[PDB]
Design a protein around this motif. Structure first.
Motif, PDB file in Angstrom:
ATOM      1  N   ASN A 222       0.823  -1.202   0.000  1.00 34.58           N
ATOM      2  CA  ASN A 222       0.000   0.000   0.000  1.00 34.58           C
ATOM      3  C   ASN A 222       0.860   1.256   0.000  1.00 34.58           C
ATOM      4  N   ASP A 223       2.103   1.149   0.476  1.00 35.05           N
ATOM      5  CA  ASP A 223       3.049   2.248   0.325  1.00 35.05           C
ATOM      6  C   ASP A 223       3.492   2.414  -1.124  1.00 35.05           C
ATOM      7  N   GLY A 224       3.238   1.417  -1.971  1.00 35.28           N
ATOM      8  CA  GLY A 224       3.610   1.493  -3.366  1.00 35.28           C
ATOM      9  C   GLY A 224       5.000   0.994  -3.671  1.00 35.28           C
ATOM     10  N   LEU A 225       5.409  -0.126  -3.079  1.00 39.66           N
ATOM     11  CA  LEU A 225       6.785  -0.588  -3.139  1.00 39.66           C
ATOM     12  C   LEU A 225       6.841  -2.104  -3.239  1.00 39.66           C
ATOM     13  N   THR A 226       7.745  -2.580  -4.082  1.00 39.90           N
ATOM     14  CA  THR A 226       8.110  -3.982  -4.145  1.00 39.90           C
ATOM     15  C   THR A 226       9.058  -4.313  -2.998  1.00 39.90           C
ATOM     16  N   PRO A 227       9.238  -5.597  -2.667  1.00 42.10           N
ATOM     17  CA  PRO A 227      10.191  -5.930  -1.602  1.00 42.10           C
ATOM     18  C   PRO A 227      11.607  -5.527  -1.924  1.00 42.10           C
ATOM     19  N   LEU A 228      11.965  -5.479  -3.202  1.00 43.14           N
ATOM     20  CA  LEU A 228      13.273  -4.977  -3.589  1.00 43.14           C
ATOM     21  C   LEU A 228      13.418  -3.507  -3.224  1.00 43.14           C
ATOM     22  N   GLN A 229      12.396  -2.706  -3.519  1.00 42.01           N
ATOM     23  CA  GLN A 229      12.429  -1.295  -3.163  1.00 42.01           C
ATOM     24  C   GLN A 229      12.328  -1.102  -1.658  1.00 42.01           C
ATOM     25  N   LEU A 230      11.658  -2.021  -0.965  1.00 43.85           N
ATOM     26  CA  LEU A 230      11.500  -1.898   0.479  1.00 43.85           C
ATOM     27  C   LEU A 230      12.791  -2.246   1.205  1.00 43.85           C
ATOM     28  N   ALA A 231      13.537  -3.225   0.693  1.00 40.79           N
ATOM     29  CA  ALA A 231      14.819  -3.571   1.289  1.00 40.79           C
ATOM     30  C   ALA A 231      15.853  -2.478   1.076  1.00 40.79           C
ATOM     31  N   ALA A 232      15.579  -1.531   0.178  1.00 43.82           N
ATOM     32  CA  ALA A 232      16.430  -0.369  -0.018  1.00 43.82           C
ATOM     33  C   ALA A 232      15.973   0.830   0.794  1.00 43.82           C
ATOM     34  N   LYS A 233      14.669   1.117   0.794  1.00 42.41           N
ATOM     35  CA  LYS A 233      14.139   2.184   1.634  1.00 42.41           C
ATOM     36  C   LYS A 233      14.453   1.917   3.097  1.00 42.41           C
ATOM     37  N   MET A 234      14.111   0.727   3.573  1.00 43.84           N
ATOM     38  CA  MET A 234      14.660   0.224   4.815  1.00 43.84           C
ATOM     39  C   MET A 234      16.105  -0.202   4.580  1.00 43.84           C
ATOM     40  N   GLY A 235      16.912  -0.118   5.628  1.00 42.52           N
ATOM     41  CA  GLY A 235      18.337  -0.347   5.488  1.00 42.52           C
ATOM     42  C   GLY A 235      18.736  -1.797   5.634  1.00 42.52           C
ATOM     43  N   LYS A 236      18.290  -2.637   4.704  1.00 44.13           N
ATOM     44  CA  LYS A 236      18.503  -4.082   4.770  1.00 44.13           C
ATOM     45  C   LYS A 236      19.469  -4.446   3.651  1.00 44.13           C
ATOM     46  N   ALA A 237      20.691  -4.813   4.038  1.00 47.87           N
ATOM     47  CA  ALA A 237      21.785  -4.937   3.083  1.00 47.87           C
ATOM     48  C   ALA A 237      22.060  -6.383   2.701  1.00 47.87           C
ATOM     49  N   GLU A 238      22.007  -7.304   3.664  1.00 43.63           N
ATOM     50  CA  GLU A 238      22.258  -8.708   3.355  1.00 43.63           C
ATOM     51  C   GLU A 238      21.197  -9.248   2.405  1.00 43.63           C
ATOM     52  N   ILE A 239      19.933  -8.936   2.684  1.00 46.66           N
ATOM     53  CA  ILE A 239      18.838  -9.414   1.852  1.00 46.66           C
ATOM     54  C   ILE A 239      18.931  -8.806   0.456  1.00 46.66           C
ATOM     55  N   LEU A 240      19.379  -7.555   0.367  1.00 46.80           N
ATOM     56  CA  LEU A 240      19.474  -6.892  -0.926  1.00 46.80           C
ATOM     57  C   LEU A 240      20.642  -7.443  -1.730  1.00 46.80           C
ATOM     58  N   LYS A 241      21.755  -7.725  -1.055  1.00 52.26           N
ATOM     59  CA  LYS A 241      22.881  -8.380  -1.702  1.00 52.26           C
ATOM     60  C   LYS A 241      22.468  -9.737  -2.244  1.00 52.26           C
ATOM     61  N   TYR A 242      21.647 -10.464  -1.486  1.00 55.58           N
ATOM     62  CA  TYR A 242      21.119 -11.725  -1.986  1.00 55.58           C
ATOM     63  C   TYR A 242      20.300 -11.507  -3.246  1.00 55.58           C
ATOM     64  N   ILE A 243      19.379 -10.546  -3.200  1.00 57.32           N
ATOM     65  CA  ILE A 243      18.432 -10.372  -4.297  1.00 57.32           C
ATOM     66  C   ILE A 243      19.156  -9.947  -5.567  1.00 57.32           C
ATOM     67  N   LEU A 244      19.998  -8.921  -5.470  1.00 60.61           N
ATOM     68  CA  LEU A 244      20.624  -8.365  -6.664  1.00 60.61           C
ATOM     69  C   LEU A 244      21.645  -9.313  -7.280  1.00 60.61           C
ATOM     70  N   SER A 245      22.073 -10.336  -6.544  1.00 59.92           N
ATOM     71  CA  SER A 245      23.077 -11.298  -6.995  1.00 59.92           C
ATOM     72  C   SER A 245      22.538 -12.696  -6.729  1.00 59.92           C
ATOM     73  N   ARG A 246      21.943 -13.294  -7.757  1.00 64.91           N
ATOM     74  CA  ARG A 246      21.315 -14.604  -7.662  1.00 64.91           C
ATOM     75  C   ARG A 246      21.749 -15.479  -8.824  1.00 64.91           C
ATOM     76  N   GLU A 247      22.419 -16.581  -8.504  1.00 66.18           N
ATOM     77  CA  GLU A 247      22.821 -17.579  -9.484  1.00 66.18           C
ATOM     78  C   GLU A 247      22.144 -18.886  -9.113  1.00 66.18           C
ATOM     79  N   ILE A 248      20.993 -19.150  -9.722  1.00 69.75           N
ATOM     80  CA  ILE A 248      20.215 -20.351  -9.449  1.00 69.75           C
ATOM     81  C   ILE A 248      20.663 -21.432 -10.421  1.00 69.75           C
ATOM     82  N   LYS A 249      20.902 -22.637  -9.897  1.00 65.47           N
ATOM     83  CA  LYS A 249      21.444 -23.713 -10.717  1.00 65.47           C
ATOM     84  C   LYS A 249      20.350 -24.483 -11.447  1.00 65.47           C
ATOM     85  N   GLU A 250      19.165 -24.595 -10.851  1.00 63.26           N
ATOM     86  CA  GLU A 250      18.085 -25.366 -11.452  1.00 63.26           C
ATOM     87  C   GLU A 250      17.681 -24.772 -12.795  1.00 63.26           C
ATOM     88  N   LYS A 251      17.718 -25.601 -13.839  1.00 60.59           N
ATOM     89  CA  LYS A 251      17.373 -25.129 -15.176  1.00 60.59           C
ATOM     90  C   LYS A 251      15.901 -24.759 -15.279  1.00 60.59           C
TER      91      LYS A 251
END
Lengths: 613, 68, 137
Positions: A222-251
């Motif tokens: 309702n604030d108008g934000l995705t969890p990616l934008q929320l992890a940036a507005k809020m100061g959440k760095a580990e979760i954002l590092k996870y999100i922005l850098s994802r190498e999934i092996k499953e085809k």
């Protein structure tokens, strides 16, 4: 009587036998009623004050025999056909609204009972919408997205999360009263690594891989934000590092990734990050959110993440350097024309005054817009003061006023002091200027306040000692006026004055003593500002200087990018379009890496031919 | 800091010693609570958030977990 | 082991006040130099001896100097033992009374602990806080 006995036997749980006999007595009571048996049975078995059932009370108060008690309660409810109405009950309280037995069993790490209740027809989408679960202050409650699934995810209970996700009735996309789904909740509950030991990242991965879709990260609260934008507005760095850098092996689940390796021949590997909602193309992107807020005080850990960092470097390499140097040149010529005017004060003078009045209006409008849109913004206030003084001086020059020149130089002398701003370009000079700012803010004002009160204290004294009149000679009367005495003390701290025994005073010894004590106090005060400076600066001005400098640079880079028009943005639009997976074409950023420690067979890769093309 | 906060504690207790009885009784910190059956005592409430150690909360006074 | 044996014996008197007035807990407070020196056994024996006697008698006694062991661990500079005393979460439901730190509610990681202020606040004479602040020794 009976009701209190039931709740007490459930809480204490000394024996299930006295619970069995008591429930038999209640069956004997209920057999008399012909109709409306379920409603009366609930009302006798449920506390009408809060809406609390005996099952909830048994769950709140854990004891080794609770499994048996719960079984007994469930079998009884099945015998009389109230099981669905019995489990799914919730508090009518304002604060605990929606809280069911399942949220309670999950709050207390009871896996088996949760399975028994889900099998017995429990509501897994129970929304706990209350002041305790949706607070304004953090100390008064605990927010977890207002569901059982998100509760189990936040409290590190992965088995129950698997159970909740496996169940068919469960809705992973359930948006709570605040709009936050489960991933938003995990973002709100990701304080740090040293505090949590990094379980929220794993549960994010689990929940998002159990649902192979972009739905959850696509939803906006309702604030108008995705969890990616929320992890940036809020100061959440580990979760954002996870999100922005994802190498999934499953085809199968390759699409959900955001970091892709399009070729690696060996230790070399060209990773391919994604830029959908990170670049400044879309509104309120991740990078704008990171840079344009001061509430966090973690932005250095945020911007050292790889795609953001490389975006800022590329945006500097392309255009922002040139625009910065260009603005520096304009301001340079501006203030030099101002100085030529002030020093020589008709044709050249008129043209210079015209150019000054033109450029000052531009600076004034920029400063006004920046202030209306609003210790990082002090520079804008000072530029605005400069432009105000300049336009006032040019106004008063036409009229026959004398105070125009005082309005002029006070801008000019300020103008060069504002050129410190444009020292932000060079790394060394940038850290140097930010150090000047932090020092003049933190340490020097302490010295200056104490020195000013010492001036105003010793000056009245030394002037009072000269209460004897000058007696026909003003030269004999030094330290006569208070202003003159303060001026002599300011001379004396430097070395300009003339220390001497007074002849016009009544107590020259006391005069000399006060003056020497003044010198010594000024000396030790200087010494202590030096001490506190050396003590605070170590590990502060070496680090915090750069942490503030690079942050100001990011702010300026994004400002200049906001100044440009659409077509130059489309020209300088960083990134290259790539086909990450079949039917997906997206912007991406190419970063080449060399890694020698971890060897493996490169199975996951996009381009079969490993080379630049 | 070790000397500063200590001077501050000394001054705070000095000013508390200056006051009269009724203002002390007004500003008397803490809330009366029933810790155990037949015991009523002054106590101080401090809220804590801990993520490392998980366990079932067996020992607790108020069954309804919220401020009242 | 010998402490268990001495406590188990019927003739033993745990409340025995010596010539100085100090009972056993006072003595343990006088013998609690630090952690790096002792490796923190005095705290455990304090806990043991006070749980073997489920009463407020020992911490209630005052020595000839006029001090409880709580006040003595403050007058003397004994910090580990005092941290133990002022923060006690006893799990046994029988000996819940002897605690001074209580958790009145916890829904999850949140937990509202409930400390005690009988002889710590400045209401009583020569409280713990006055003793800590008004001495330079």
């Amino acid at each position: 009587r009976l009701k209190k006995r039931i709740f007490a036997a459930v809480s204490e749980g000394c024996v299930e036998e006295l619970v069995e006999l008591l429930v038999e007595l209640q069956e004997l009571c209920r057999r008399r009623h012909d109709e409306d048996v379920p409603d009366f049975l609930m009302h006798k078995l449920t506390a009408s004050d809060t809406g609390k059932t005996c099952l909830m009370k048994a769950l709140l108060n854990i004891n080794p025999n609770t499994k048996e008690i719960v079984r007994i309660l469930l079998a009884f409810a099945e015998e009389n056909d109230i099981l669905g109405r019995f489990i799914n009950a919730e508090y009518t309280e304002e604060a605990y609204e929606g809280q069911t037995a399942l949220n309670i069993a999950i709050e207390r790490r009871q896996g088996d009972i949760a399975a028994l209740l889900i099998a017995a027809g429990a509501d897994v989408n129970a929304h706990a919408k209350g002041a305790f679960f949706n607070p304004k202050y953090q100390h008064e409650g605990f927010y977890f997205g207002e569901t059982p699934l998100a509760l189990a995810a936040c409290t590190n209970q992965p088995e129950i999360v698997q159970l909740l996700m496996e169940h068919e009735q469960t809705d992973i996309t359930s948006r709570d009263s605040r709009g936050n789904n489960i991933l938003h909740a995990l973002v709100t509950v990701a304080e740090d690594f040293k505090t949590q030991n990094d379980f929220v990242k794993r549960m994010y991965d689990m929940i998002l891989l159990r649902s192979g879709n972009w739905e959850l990260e696509t939803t906006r609260n309702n604030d108008g934000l995705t969890p990616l934008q929320l992890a940036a507005k809020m100061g959440k760095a580990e979760i954002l590092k996870y999100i922005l850098s994802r190498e999934i092996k499953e085809k199968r689940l390759r699409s959900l990734s955001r970091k892709f390796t399009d070729w690696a021949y060996g230790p070399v590997s060209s990773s391919l990050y994604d830029l959908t909602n990170v670049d400044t193309t879309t509104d309120n992107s991740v990078l704008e959110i990171t840079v344009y807020n001061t509430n966090i005080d973690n932005r250095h850990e945020m911007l050292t993440l790889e795609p953001l960092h490389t975006l800022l470097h590329m945006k500097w390499k392309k255009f922002a350097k040139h625009m910065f140097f260009l603005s520096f040149c304009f301001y340079f010529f501006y203030n030099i024309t101002l100085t030529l005017v002030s020093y020589y004060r008709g044709w050249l003078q008129l043209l210079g005054r015209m150019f000054v009045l033109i450029w000052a209006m531009c600076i004034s409008v920029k400063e006004g817009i920046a202030i209306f849109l609003l210790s990082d913004a002090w520079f804008h206030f000072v530029f605005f003061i400069q432009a105000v003084l300049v336009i006032l001086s040019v106004f008063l020059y036409l009229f026959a006023y004398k105070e125009y020149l005082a309005c002029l130089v006070l801008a000019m002398a300020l103008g060069w002091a504002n050129m410190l701003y444009y020292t932000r370009g060079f790394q060394s000079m940038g850290m140097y200027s930010v150090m000047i700012q932090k020092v003049i803010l933190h340490d020097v004002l302490k010295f200056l306040f104490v020195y000013i009160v010492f001036l105003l204290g010793f000056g009245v004294a030394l002037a009072s000692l000269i209460e004897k009149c000058p007696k026909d000679n003003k030269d004999c009367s030094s330290y006569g006026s208070f202003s003159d005495a303060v001026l002599e003390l300011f001379k004396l701290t430097i070395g300009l004055g003339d220390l001497n025994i007074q002849q016009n005073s009544k107590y020259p010894i006391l005069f000399l003593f006060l003056l020497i004590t003044y010198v010594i106090l000024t000396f030790v005060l200087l010494l202590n500002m030096l001490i506190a400076l050396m003590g605070e600066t170590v590990e502060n001005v070496s680090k915090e200087s750069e942490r503030i400098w690079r942050l100001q640079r990011a702010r300026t880079i994004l400002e200049f990018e906001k100044m440009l028009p659409e077509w130059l943005r489309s020209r300088f639009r960083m990134g290259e379009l790539c086909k990450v997976a079949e039917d997906d074409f997206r912007l991406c950023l190419r970063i080449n890496e060399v890694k020698w420690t971890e060897w493996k067979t490169h199975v996951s890769f996009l381009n079969e031919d490993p080379g630049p093309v």
